[PDB]
C-alpha cells in the first residue's frame, strides 16, 4: 500500500495559508520517488534528510501540510524564518525533520478577473506557536477602544485577501506548498519494504 502523496500534491484546490490543510499520512509505504522526479517545483528544501535517500528510510509518523501563498513569501516557509507568514499564518518547528516542497501555480490559483479567495492573516497580537492554525476572524483591536464587532479606525479585519491576478509579477503569483513532516516521537511509513 502506497502512501497517498498524489492525493495531496495533485489535489484540485488547496486551502488558504491561514487555514492550512494538514493530511496525516501513516500506515503505508512511502514513495518519495515521485516527489524529487518532477522538475516542476520552484523550491525543494529538506531539513535533516537529503532529497536522495528519502525513498529508502523508515518514519514513525508523517504529516503533510499544504496551502497557497505568493512567490515572494515562499522563502519564509523555513524553520526560523520570520515575517507575516511565518509568524501569523504558518510557523514550522525549529527541529523540523522533513521537506518543504513548493511549485508555481499561476494557472490553477489565478482567476481571469482576479482570484480573491485565498486569504492570509495580516494582524495578530502575537506570533504563532509551532504548527498553529488561527481560524479566527475577530475584528482586530489595534488600540484600546473596544471594537464590539464593528469596523473602523483601530478596528481592522485580521485577514486580507491575496490579490491573485494573472498579470501579477512572479513574486505575486500563487505558489502551492506541501510541507512533509517526516519523523518525530510505532512505525509504518517505510521505504525499503
Amino acid at each position, epitope marked *: 500500500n502506497l502512501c497517498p502523496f498524489g492525493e495531496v500534491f495533485n489535489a484540485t484546490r488547496f486551502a488558504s495559508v491561514y487555514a492550512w490543510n494538514r493530511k496525516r499520512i501513516s500506515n503505508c509505504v512511502a514513495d518519495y520517488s515521485v516527489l524529487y522526479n518532477s522538475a516542476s517545483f520552484s523550491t525543494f528544501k529538506c531539513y535533516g534528510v537529503s532529497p536522495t535517500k528519502l525513498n529508502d528510510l523508515c518514519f514513525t509518523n508523517v504529516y503533510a501540510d499544504s496551502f497557497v501563498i505568493r512567490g515572494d513569501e515562499v522563502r519564509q516557509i523555513a524553520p526560523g524564518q520570520t515575517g507575516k507568514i511565518a*509568524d501569523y499564518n504558518y510557523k514550522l518547528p525549529d527541529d523540523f525533520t522533513g521537506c518543504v516542497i513548493a511549485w508555481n501555480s499561476n494557472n490553477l490559483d489565478s482567476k481571469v478577473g482576479g482570484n480573491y479567495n485565498y486569504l492570509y492573516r495580516l494582524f495578530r497580537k502575537s506570533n504563532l506557536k509551532p504548527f498553529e492554525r488561527d481560524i479566527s476572524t475577530e475584528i482586530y*483591536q*489595534a488600540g484600546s477602544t473596544p471594537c464590539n464587532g464593528v469596523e473602523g479606525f483601530n478596528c481592522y*479585519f485580521p485577514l*486580507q485577501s491575496y490579490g491573485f491576478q494573472p498579470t501579477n509579477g512572479v513574486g*505575486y503569483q500563487p505558489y502551492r506548498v506541501v510541507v512533509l513532516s517526516f519523523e518525530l516521537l510505532p512505525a509504518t511509513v517505510c521505504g525499503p519494504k
Partner: antibody, heavy 118, light 105 residues
Framework: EVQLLESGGGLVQPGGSLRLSCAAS????????MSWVRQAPGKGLEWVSV???????YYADSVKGRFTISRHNSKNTLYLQMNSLRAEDTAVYYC????????????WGQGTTVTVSS | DIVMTQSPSSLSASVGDRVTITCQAS??????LNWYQQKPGKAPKLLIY???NLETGVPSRFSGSGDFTFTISSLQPEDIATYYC?????????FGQGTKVEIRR
C-alpha cells in the same frame, strides 16, 4: 486622542549611546506594527527599523548591529536603543504605525532630533 | 533592496494647475506603494496608500496609480511640500528621493 509623543535625547557625542521613546495615544504599541523613520539634515526620509506585533525585529543595514527596538506596554512606549552611535546618524527621528496593506503609517510622531558631535 | 527614483524636485507650478510625480522602482512590487507629504517643517503625513487608495482627510485633488505615479488635480497653496513614495519590499521599506513641489505666484 490620537498622538505619538516622542521623548528623545539631543546630544551624545560620537561613540556614545542614547535611547529614544515614543509615548503613544490613540494607538497601542504592543499590538501594532511600529517602525522608526529618520530624516537626516538632507531632507530625505530613510527607514530605520520595525518590531511587528508578535516581536520580530527588522532593521536597516546601516543600523543593523548598533540599534535595537524595545517596547513596554506597561507605559505603552516604544524605544530605540542607539548604541555605538556614529556621525551620519544625526537626523530627526520619527516613530509611526505602519498598517501596511490597510493604511500606511497612518499616525506619525512629531520629531526628536539627535545630534552627534564632539 | 529596491531603488525608487522619483521625479525631479524643481516643480514651479502655479495655483490651480497640477502636479505629476512619478516613482519608478528597481524591482516592482504590486499595489504596495505609499505616498506621503512632508509639509515644510513637520512630520510626514500619509496621502496615498496601496498605490491608489486615499486616506480619510486627503482632498479629492490627490490621486495615484500602480512604474508608479502621483497626481494633484488642482494645485492649492496648502500643497507646498516634499512628496516621498514608500514601498513594502523586504525590510528595508525603501523611501523615495523626495520630490519638492513649489507654488509660483
Amino acid at each position: 486622542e490620537v498622538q505619538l509623543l516622542e521623548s528623545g535625547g539631543g546630544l551624545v557625542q560620537p561613540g556614545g549611546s542614547l535611547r529614544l521613546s515614543c509615548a503613544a495615544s490613540g494607538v497601542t504599541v504592543t499590538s501594532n506594527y511600529m517602525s522608526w523613520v529618520r530624516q537626516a539634515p538632507g531632507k530625505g526620509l530613510e527607514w530605520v527599523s520595525v518590531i511587528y506585533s508578535g516581536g520580530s525585529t527588522y532593521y536597516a543595514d546601516s543600523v543593523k548591529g548598533r540599534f535595537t527596538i524595545s517596547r513596554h506596554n506597561s507605559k505603552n512606549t516604544l524605544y530605540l536603543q542607539m548604541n555605538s552611535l556614529r556621525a551620519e546618524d544625526t537626523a530627526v527621528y520619527y516613530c509611526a504605525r505602519d498598517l501596511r496593506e490597510a493604511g500606511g503609517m497612518d499616525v506619525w510622531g512629531q520629531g526628536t532630533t539627535v545630534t552627534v558631535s564632539s | 533592496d529596491i531603488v525608487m527614483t522619483q521625479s525631479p524636485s524643481s516643480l514651479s507650478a502655479s495655483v490651480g494647475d497640477r502636479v505629476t510625480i512619478t516613482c519608478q522602482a528597481s524591482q516592482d512590487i504590486n499595489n504596495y506603494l505609499n505616498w506621503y507629504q512632508q509639509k515644510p517643517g513637520k512630520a510626514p503625513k500619509l496621502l496615498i496608500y496601496d498605490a491608489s487608495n486615499l486616506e480619510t482627510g486627503v482632498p479629492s485633488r490627490f490621486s495615484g496609480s500602480g512604474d508608479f505615479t502621483f497626481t494633484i488635480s488642482s494645485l492649492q497653496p496648502e500643497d507646498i511640500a516634499t512628496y516621498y513614495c514608500q514601498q513594502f519590499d523586504n525590510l528595508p521599506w525603501t523611501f523615495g528621493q523626495g520630490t519638492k513641489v513649489e507654488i509660483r505666484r
